[PDB]
A = this chain, B = another copy of it.
Amino acid sequence: HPVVFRCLDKLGLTVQSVKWYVGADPDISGTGMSAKERKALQQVLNRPNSAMSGAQLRYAATLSWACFGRMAFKVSVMGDGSVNAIWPLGIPFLKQEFNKYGEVTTFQYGDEGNRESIKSFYSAAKNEKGRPIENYAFMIVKPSINGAMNLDVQNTPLQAVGMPVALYNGLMERALEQCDGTPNSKWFVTAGRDIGEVQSKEIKDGIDDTKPGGDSAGEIIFVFGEDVKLQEIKNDLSDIHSKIPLDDQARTIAGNFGIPIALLGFAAADGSKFASNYDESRKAFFEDTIEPGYLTPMEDGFSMFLCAPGSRVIFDRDSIPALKKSRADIAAVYEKVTFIDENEKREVTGWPKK
């Protein structure tokens, strides 16, 4: 779709541009992984397998989260529990099973041609530290109103963009049909019945000689002894595509996804009134949509299902280009305050303790 695809690609690229790393948990300590294990998991976090890097994994995860509101992955584990590979699963081809208490016990991945079964993180055998010692899979779900998180209730923007998309498609289809179906002419000429069998040809030959490149281009048309009539045809195609409703549908679709329409490149007549300038919109889009919408869910899910307690997967927010100038300005402002310790100043602006 010429509108929804742009939004999905924008979200995917924006979430892709951000990195992460394996760090320590500020809140809970003591059971964390050693430095060697953290560095070992770091390598997998950069090259999950032989056909994908981290950026592509982020892109696929973002697309899955946007379209379906849930994402899943498969994890390969060695004998001692350390991870060595990660694979993404196609949400459309995934099925799950439950026990009588409601915990997921098995993931069924396949279709009518081939099938594969995977043990869930809960049902997989574990070592003394609680880490799995066999291949397993896990999935993340966006909550809903009812509160039953693992059941077939979804929360995605595509729920509500039905009517706008339908109307947009209808208007564009009408516009396409009309251009091909409409005669391409500008004059409509009629004549009486009292013109012979030859002067009738003569008249049209005389008119045709005024075409560009003709023998009498640019001259007047003189007709003798006959009342011919002309009717100008005003083929007004300036509103073939129904500009106003078509723009409104695009605005609604862009809004439901949480993307300021200025960043999408589409038209908006009142930019300065709300979107004061490009940079503020770029900053606001990130801070208000990407951080609480896409970064946090993946961060929390990977931290819950890969790292042992005491460690976490952390996204690097402050290093993004869109926030460099603001970060520098705020950092320069705190340089003057003196009732605050140096460590607190560092903590506020995103730097770690010395």
Contact = CB atoms under 8 A, between A and B. Distances in A.
B237 A242 contact: yes
Contacts of A344: 351
B255 A160 contact: no
Contacts of A171: 179, 237
Contacts of A188: 220-221, 223, 230
B185 A220 contact: yes
Interface string A15-51: 0110000000001100000000001001100110011
16 contacts: A2-B163, A9-B157, A55-B292, A60-B144, A64-B145, A167-B175, A174-B179, A193-B224, A204-B222, A232-B234, A248-B267, A267-B268, A268-B274, A287-B321, A325-B330, A332-B336
A90 interface: yes
A339 B332 contact: no
Contact of A245 (B150, B237, B291, B296): B237
Interface in A45-90: 46-47, 50-53, 55-56, 59-60, 63-64, 67, 88-90
B339 A333 contact: no
Given A191-B225, A335-B339, 17 more contacts: A2-B160, A6-B160, A17-B292, A63-B143, A64-B145, A90-B147, A163-B172, A177-B212, A181-B218, A183-B187, A183-B221, A191-B224, A255-B264, A255-B265, A282-B284, A331-B340, A332-B334
Nearest to A234: B232
B181 A143 contact: no
Contacts of A144: 60, 63
A190 interface: yes
Nearest to A177: B218
A306 to B, nearest CB: 14
Interface residues of A, number: 181
A261 interface: yes
A149 B56 contact: yes
Interface string A297-310: 10011001000000
A161 interface: yes
Nearest to A170: B179
Contacts of A338: 335
Nearest to A190: B223
A256 to B, nearest CB: 6
B2 A28 contact: no
Nearest to A232: B234
A176 B167 contact: yes
Contact of A278 (B217, B280, B322): B280
A210 B225 contact: no
Contacts of A274: 262, 268, 271-272, 275, 277-278, 281
Contacts of A186: 178, 182, 218, 220, 235
Interface in A222-246: 222-228, 230-245
Contacts of A237: 171, 239, 242, 245
Contacts of A207: 183, 220, 222
Interface in A181-218: 181-193, 195, 200, 204, 207-208, 210-213, 217-218
Shortest beta-carbon contacts, A-B, top 5: A181-B218, A90-B147, A271-B273, A255-B265, A187-B220
Nearest to A262: B274
